[PDB]
Design a protein around this ligand. Sequence first.
Ligand SMILES: CCN(CC)CCCCN1c2ccccc2Oc2ccc(Cl)cc21
Length: 273
Amino acid sequence: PLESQYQVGPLLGSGGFGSVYSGIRVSDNLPVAIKHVEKDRISDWGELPNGTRVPMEVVLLKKVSSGFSGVIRLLDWFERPDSFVLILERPEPVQDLFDFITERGALQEELARSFFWQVLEAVRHCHNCGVLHRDIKDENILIDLNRGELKLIDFGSGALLKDTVYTDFDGTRVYSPPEWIRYHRYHGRSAAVWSLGILLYDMVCGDIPFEHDEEIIRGQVFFRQRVSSECQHLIRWCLALRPSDRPTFEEIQNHPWMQDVLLPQETAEIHLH
Ligand SMILES: CCN(CC)CCCCN1c2ccccc2Oc2ccc(Cl)cc21
């Protein structure tokens, strides 16, 4: 029933996540993304409530897709002989943060604050639903350009949240924390805070702080652009080498630099229209 119920359009992208195409739901003209993944190329599986075997990505998406979140929500999925096909939300118009930064260069602090705050709310939501994303970065963040609302994509590299150690990582090396590099061991939250550190630096600097492993192990941050003393502090605190020196999400959200954030609407007025 799938090829009848959604109207396929252009290819939006392809990579390690499969092939995403633009789509329109026939029922009510809703714009959507259709994501095809080959069964052969799924290393991590799981099983939902009703007890059937699906890719872990579907498990995790189902857990975060209730209500309004800053997460692109799963609407439906289909199994095919050799692929799995996912129907997700599609903002119209849209741009990933990587392209946005690549185009507009480093971001005014006011804008980064809105954006980063929103990311934090989304990641909190995920954690609160028992999900760990494990691959927070600019290319997994979409911007609805009209509403100013940021939205997270690309689960599995994700996992269920747990308080024990993780000894596996199939996310992005340059966003991985020193404890992963050295010891092949990390804990979800503190490793998330690291990657948010990198995210925030990316936003205000136009580029990621570390390229090689030795730079990560060293954990030392130079600023090529004018960035406020308070923003530099927050960045360095998130990028603390010892995980227990890193802030909690609460501590991040109460940090002086995170004060008087703009709402999404007004962010777009000022910065995207
Ligand atoms: C490469 C260019 N851009 C798109 C503007 C980023 C790739 C986005 C592909 N993608 C995507 C990539 C990886 C996992 C899920 C994904 O779901 C999506 C949902 C909705 C949209 Cl619009 C896009 C995705």
